[PDB]
Amino acid sequence: DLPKSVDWRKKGYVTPVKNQKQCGSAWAFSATGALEGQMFRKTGKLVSLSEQNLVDCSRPQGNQGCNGGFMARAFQYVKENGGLDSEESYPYVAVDEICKYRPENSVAQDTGFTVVAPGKEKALMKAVATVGPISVAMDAGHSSFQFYKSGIYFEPDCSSKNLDHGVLVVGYGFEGANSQNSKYWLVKNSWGPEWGSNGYVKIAKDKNNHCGIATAASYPNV
Amino acid sequence: DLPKSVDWRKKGYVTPVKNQKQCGSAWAFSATGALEGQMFRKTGKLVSLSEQNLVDCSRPQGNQGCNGGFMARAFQYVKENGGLDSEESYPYVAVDEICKYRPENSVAQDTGFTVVAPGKEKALMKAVATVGPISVAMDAGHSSFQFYKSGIYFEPDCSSKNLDHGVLVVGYGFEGANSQNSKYWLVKNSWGPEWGSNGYVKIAKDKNNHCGIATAASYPNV
Ligand SMILES: [Cl-]
Numbered sequence: 001d002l003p004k005s006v007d008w009r010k011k012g013y014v015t016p017v018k019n020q021k022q023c024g025s026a027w028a029f030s031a032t033g034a035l036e037g038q039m040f041r042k043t044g045k046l047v048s049l050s051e052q053n054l055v056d057c058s059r060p061q062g063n064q065g066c067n068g069g070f071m072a073r074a075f076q077y078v079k080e081n082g083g084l085d086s087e088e089s090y091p092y093v094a095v096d097e098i099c100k101y102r103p104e105n106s107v108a109q110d111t112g113f114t115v116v117a118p119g120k121e122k123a124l125m126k127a128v129a130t131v132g133p134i135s136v137a138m139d140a141g142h143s144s145f146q147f148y149k150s151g152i153y154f155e156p157d158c159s160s161k162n163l164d165h166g167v168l169v170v171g172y173g174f175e176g177a178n179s180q181n182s183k184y185w186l187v188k189n190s191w192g193p194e195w196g197s198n199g200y201v202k203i204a205k206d207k208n209n210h211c212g213i214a215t216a217a218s219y220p221n222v
Numbered sequence: 223d224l225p226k227s228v229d230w231r232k233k234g235y236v237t238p239v240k241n242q243k244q245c246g247s248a249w250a251f252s253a254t255g256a257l258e259g260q261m262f263r264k265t266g267k268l269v270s271l272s273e274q275n276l277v278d279c280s281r282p283q284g285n286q287g288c289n290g291g292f293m294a295r296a297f298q299y300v301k302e303n304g305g306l307d308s309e310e311s312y313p314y315v316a317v318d319e320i321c322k323y324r325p326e327n328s329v330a331q332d333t334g335f336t337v338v339a340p341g342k343e344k345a346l347m348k349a350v351a352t353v354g355p356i357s358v359a360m361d362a363g364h365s366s367f368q369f370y371k372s373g374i375y376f377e378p379d380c381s382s383k384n385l386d387h388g389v390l391v392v393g394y395g396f397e398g399a400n401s402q403n404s405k406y407w408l409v410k411n412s413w414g415p416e417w418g419s420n421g422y423v424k425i426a427k428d429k430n431n432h433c434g435i436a437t438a439a440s441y442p443n444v
């Protein structure tokens with residue numbers, strides 16, 4: 001069956017933590033983080049991808065740059081657009097700018113995306129175990145999240161339905177010796193390495209889809 | 223000529239913070255951290271390596287498993303053995319066990335190791351700026367280290383000669399406005415994320431080889 005724990009950062013699928021700064025673009029960081037892992041699975045090369053390309057160019061697909069967006073609409077843009085530029089060639093400035101997509105600088109493609117069944121944490125565990133990092137949405141609107149530092153995050157006021165922040169599940173695990181209790185999702189944030197635990201947070205797992213991590217998960221098909 | 227600050231975590235050289243638990247294997251975590259950084263430099267792939275393989279198998283080279291050892295004897299074993307297994311293939315259980323090395327699971331190799339000039343922090347600063355993370359030993363035998371939480375660690379009773387703990391220097395920097403004062407070494411520990419500053423500590427730099435950080439530094443040759 002599935003592994004008791006998974007951590008794709010230990011296999012080379014994940015880039016160093018980034019910082020979206022004062023721009024509502026976490027959906028773009030979540031999408032590039034999922035496509036970075038799928039392109040690494042496919043080619044063996046880890047290449048940081050451009051959030052700014054997504055902020056500036058995916059309005060036609062329904063995103064609104066620094067005003068918000070959705071990872072599935074980003075993967076739809078990369079498919080429709082035929083590519084996505086590297087972080088190095090199309091740098092992040094955290095403000096809406098003119099679309100400067102350059103095909104010659106493209107280092108990634110996708111044909112669409114796969115959705116995890118909504119609200120199903122075991123479907124998400126299977127996707128994380130067999131595919132690589134997965135884009136998810138969560139309810140991050142709490143000071144307990146803003147000031148998180150360590151341990152398993154559990155917020156009684158969390159919603160599993162009304163979400164406001166895109167993040168990336170890079171694995172799952174458990175504390176202690178028993179693999180079926182005190183479980184958690186390993187989640188990469190885009191608030192810089194200085195936030196949380198080196199930029200990451202353990203979110204309580206199999207506790208009624210806490211903070212909505214399994215409500216709107218998806219990954220690009222490469 | 224040398225950079226005023228360096229942080230290899232930003233360039234993809236460093237795996238997540240690990241936890242040796244109740245086993246005197248810090249020398250093994252220091253060694254795998256250095257070899258993870260040199261293999262990434264060589265291949266572009268960051269892959270977690272097996273501390274358990276070093277604990278269980280390097281007795282011939284003079285290591286003593288959970289009862290202590292040396293990063294240099296670890297690099298010697300990888301050279302004599304012709305390989306070192308991935309953590310994924312050879313998981314860590316924090317106890318001394320029978321060697322289970324399998325060459326088919328090897329993901330790393332080295333031809334020996336290089337020693338930094340002893341006691342010379344400027345030689346250590348140069349190796350850190352030009353090679354990547356460096357294995358070092360330090361005097362961690364004070365309660366102030368066990369309870370460290372943030373800031374620049376300075377322990378008046380520290381020794382630079384009698385060292386008892388292997389750690390990994392991943393960079394260096396300074397607090398405040400100018401580069402010449404309040405300098406520190408950026409150190410990755412192996413006591414899990416919950417210890418210290420999310421598993422890391424800043425040790426005073428250019429304060430007379432504080433805690434012995436430059437006394438016994440080295441890195442594998444890949
Ligand atoms: Cl979405």
Ligand SMILES: [Cl-]
Nearest residue numbers: 292293294295
């Ligand atoms: Cl040593």
